[PDB]
Amino acid sequence: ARALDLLRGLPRVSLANLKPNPGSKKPERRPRGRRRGRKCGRGHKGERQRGTRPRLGFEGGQTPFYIRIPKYGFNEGHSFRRQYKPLSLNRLQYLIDLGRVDPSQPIDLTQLVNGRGVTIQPLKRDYGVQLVEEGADTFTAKVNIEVQLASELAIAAIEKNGGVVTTAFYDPRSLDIVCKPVPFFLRGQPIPKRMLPPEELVPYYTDAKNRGYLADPAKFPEARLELARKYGYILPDITKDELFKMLCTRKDPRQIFFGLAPGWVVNMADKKILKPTDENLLKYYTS
């Protein structure tokens, strides 16, 4: 390149030639000299020059603005409100097209996080991912995706394209484990059993219309037919699909990972899985 040719022409680059990019290093202003000295920009007497002006929000003794406004429960229980990261069908299709999410295998929160399609923060009260109808019109991938919340239109698009969608609950601990399994495996603890949804969320995940993971499977075909009739598409018979087994694969309600069972210990150092055999431990981990 011309720049490299100019380098060849120019002297050697050393530690005596380095210079910061102009504009990156603002000059430091210090109170010496006529312009920046004398009162040093602090004003004249009063509190401001003495550096003792009242706290922020103080209005000189008048009832402050942030205190004369009545208290209202805008943020009550904010730290207890569940949050679900949105996953638009546009984003899902983008990920599938770029190969960061493989639709030939069951898609869940672990796969989404691994493909970097979503960023979950369980410490920030995130409870998982919610499917979003955005991009439904242009969504064409056939996928078996498991999420936490799902809109009616998103479910309709997934099912119209021949895929399967199920809403699965994850309590914060299981959510963190599934989002970041490798750190959990390095913790050395046995895989815990996923906890059931709280009483308030139980109806959502036991309702077939939401494709809840605890809902009666016998009611799923009626709900799928209702959505197909509502949105004017023919319900594809997935049982005849070559990927029917993959589409049908769903993890057990008390299971975090598809193959691994609660109570197992993943020894990553030597590529092994220790399975407890004590009857009491097995009963507890199957409970």
Partner 1 sequence: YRARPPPRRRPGPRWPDPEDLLTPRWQLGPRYAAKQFARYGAASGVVPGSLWPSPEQLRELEAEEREWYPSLATMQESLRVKQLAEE
Partner 2 sequence: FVESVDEYQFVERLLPATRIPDPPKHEHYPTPSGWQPPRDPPPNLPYFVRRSRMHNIPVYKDITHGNRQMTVIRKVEGDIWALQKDVEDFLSPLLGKTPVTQVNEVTGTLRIKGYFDQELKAWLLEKGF
Partner 3 sequence: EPVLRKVELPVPTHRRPVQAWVESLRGFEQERVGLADLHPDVFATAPRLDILHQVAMWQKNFKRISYAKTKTRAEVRGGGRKPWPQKGTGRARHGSIRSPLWRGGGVAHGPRGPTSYYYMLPMKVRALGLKVALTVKLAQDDLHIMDSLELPTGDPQYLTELAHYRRWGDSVLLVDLTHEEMPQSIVEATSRLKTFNLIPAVGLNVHSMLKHQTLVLTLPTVAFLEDKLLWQDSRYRPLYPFSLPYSDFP
Residues that bind partner 2 (CB under 8 A): 21, 90, 93-94, 96-100, 105, 110, 113-114, 138-141, 181-182, 185, 257-260, 266-268, 271-278
Task: Pick from 14, 62, 75, 280 the residue near partner 3 by CB under 8 A.
Answer: 14
Give the residues lining the site for partner 1 (CB under 8 A).
Answer: 185-190, 195-196, 199, 202-203, 206, 214, 263, 265-270, 272, 274, 276, 278, 280-281, 284, 287
CB 198 within 8 A of CB 189: no
Size of the site for Mg ion (CB under 5 A): 2
**For partner 3, the closer CB: 92 or 164:** 92
Minimal distance, residue 183 CB to partner 3, in Å: 6
Return d(Cα 222, Cα 226) in angstroms, integer: 6
259-268 long-range contacts, Cβ below 8 Å, gap at least 24? 260/191, 261/191, 261/285, 262/190, 262/191, 262/192, 262/193, 262/194, 262/286, 263/190, 263/191, 263/193, 264/190, 264/191, 265/188, 265/189, 265/190, 265/191, 266/185, 266/191, 268/182, 268/185, 268/186
The nearest distance, CB 91 to partner 3, in angstroms, is 15
Would you say 29 or 271 has its CB closer to partner 2?
A: 271
Q: From the CB of 255, what's the least distance to partner 2, in Å?
A: 11
45 belongs to the binding site for Mg ion (CB under 5 A): yes
Report the site for partner 3 in 241-270 (rule: CB under 8 A): 268
Nearest-Å Rg of the Cα atoms of the chain is 29
- Strand 83-88: give its sheet, edge to edge: 83-88, 126-132, 149-150
List phi, psi (to 5°) of 144. Answer: -105, 100
Q: For residue 267, what are the β-bridge partners?
A: 272
Cβ closest to partner 3, residue 13 vs residue 56: 13
From partner 2, Mg ion, partner 3, none, interface partner of 67 (C-beta below 5 to 8 A by class) = none
Q: Which is nearer to partner 1, 88 or 206 (CB)?
A: 206
Q: Which of 49, 90, 105, 114 binds partner 3 (CB under 8 A)?
A: 114
Residue 46 vs 221, nearer CB to Mg ion: 46
Are 183 and 266 spatial neighbours (Cβ–Cβ below 8 Å)? no
